[PDB]
Design a protein around this nucleic acid. Sequence first.
DNA 1: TTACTGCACAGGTGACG
Length: 771
Amino acid sequence: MTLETTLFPLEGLEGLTASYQLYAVKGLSGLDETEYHKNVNLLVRRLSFSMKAPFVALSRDGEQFIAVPNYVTEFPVDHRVVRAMVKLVPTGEPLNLRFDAADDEYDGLRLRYLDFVLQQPLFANHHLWQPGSGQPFFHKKPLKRLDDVDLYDGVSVRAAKHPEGGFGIVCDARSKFITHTPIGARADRKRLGKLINRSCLYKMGDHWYQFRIDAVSDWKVGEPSLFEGNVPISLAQQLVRTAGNAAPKSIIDLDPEGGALEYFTSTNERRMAPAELCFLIEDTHGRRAAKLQRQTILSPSERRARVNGFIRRYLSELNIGGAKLSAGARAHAFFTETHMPPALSFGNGTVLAPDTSKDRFQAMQEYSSMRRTMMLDKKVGFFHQDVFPPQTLLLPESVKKSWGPAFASDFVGTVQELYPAGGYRPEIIEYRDKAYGGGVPGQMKALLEVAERGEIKSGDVLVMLHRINGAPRAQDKLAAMVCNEFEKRFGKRVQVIHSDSPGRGYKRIFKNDKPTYVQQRGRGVNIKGYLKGAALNKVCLGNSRWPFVLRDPLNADVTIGIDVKNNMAVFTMVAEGGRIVRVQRSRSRQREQLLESQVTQVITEMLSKELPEIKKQVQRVVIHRDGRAWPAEIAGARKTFADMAESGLIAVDADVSVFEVLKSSPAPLRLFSFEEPTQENPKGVINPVLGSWLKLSENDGYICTTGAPLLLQGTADPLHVRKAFGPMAIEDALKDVFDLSCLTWPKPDSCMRLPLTIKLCDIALFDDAAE
DNA sequence: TTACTGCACAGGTGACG
Ligand SMILES: [Mg+2]
């Protein structure tokens, strides 16, 4: 029950003052709403980079209002571009904001200034460096050597409300991999060309920073490439001219024949940098480096020690102007009651409840294991038990002709053992995977023409696809294409598997004087485990056969997930306790955003179909956005439900609340708990327990959907949820985010960081790179 | 083993040839 955060108090905040001047944007009378807020935040962004001051937007009433720091001198007031031209008329009354005050609507304004001024002393520390604005600060000295790549340790620092009052700082340790030797002066024109879009650390003497390689310069370092007042000047001359005092040898003694790289400034100017001083950042998610990836996963005591060490070392004294700020060395710590996992309903009227008489950890591990063993027990089994509708297994011809038949028999038998009530009996069909070219077009040509023939009787299809490209930081457009077309042109519900991993599970054997394929079990996959996982996720879940549901009601009657990526939106809906789950994909005119009319269309359609099966009149709705919510999306959701309350489809006083689920948090905070110190663990720091939670604010909370009993290595990463709108209390929203993350359907015996609502969003999108 | 779970990065935007 004893929890420590990575929130540190801020001292000397008194006498620190932040003066702004509200302007209002004449803009265009016509508000495309979605285009209106894009242009506002575009200008706020443009202004911040060009004048280097903490510009902010204050969206109240008219939602305009650009806040200009009072200390900037000449201010254009009128600004070009931005479609129609905009003008800013100051709203008078210049604001001098204090940090000892109660909660205002100007707290977003205070947080922007606080963030901005706090990283000035750090940016001036000769032993630290920052890749770019807003990023963590790293030590210049590498932490670890790692044999041709260097490992750098850094810490993020972000301003945040303090739950006991006032303001503070939330921090987390970060890791970065940079190759040890520079790109080099002797690297030729073609080799530099092969680095476009890669990112490098540039050691410009004592000023280190990161940039993206855009092009290769036509001019070497000692040849004139720019001019310093008419006269042509080499890059070598420019770096000598802007060095100070005791400049390092490396920036005044550059190889004249070396090449230079080119990058774009955040105001879109072009600059050059000598390849002799540039060190490639290892995108480790782009090129599989798993021995590296382990270096990034920290034990709780390592993670707590690195963060606190940075605090006591660089934020003890902090001068911003004539201000003396300190970050206290002791993080905020608290006592709380921890949420227990919810009671669950399985087959045959069987409930699973956490045992309240055992100690918490033993009780959590028993509960979690039992989610798997109850699902498998033919005396209890799946909550939803029924025969499947007809099914199809669509295999490449090359596979059907080799190990396909052996895989299918094993796979069929695995489904029937996992879901005995289903009678799984698929028709096995093939497509000509070698007749048209093996790329994405050509594979799709063969898949569509099997479809066009009508060989896919039955509406459900599981199709085995070939892998085109690896690199886990890419996009598999073939699976998205197949799902898109089969859904749109035929009426099919499609699930996908790939052919590389199951094929590794079979080896050819000579038996009774005939070649046969049998299971193997060396290295490449664990084929028995693969068959069970695919059986649950692709056939059972893909037919909406839910293994277990919540016994008791959530705080919300209905919660809806929303994610938009790649011009494809997903809407998920969970009602009853997961007895009613729905997923609609729909195309979107913007890459990552939704029109107001589209939110209200899809949601009134989705809910209306289901309302006659919701036998409780509905009076609390919650929307879970993956990431930031946009005002037209908030508006489209408030309209949907104000409408339904007037028809009588829903309680006449039902209310909606919108929460942003920030899985990559702008203020990532950690929680730790404690234990008897023990040789290996001299400070006794351990992960928090599964149900731990903390609110900072009426608008910001954290729940551990992952934690102590169920984690193998590393430290739990608490899920940040933020209230965008609505009456519901953040504590109530955190509780049923937690209950929804206990519906661990893809892997029953496990913890799962995302609630089922946006978990369904990640499954269904997989970044839909077509339509 | 990407059938699947965690942790990692992902987030946050002022610099700087
Ligand atoms: Mg993180």
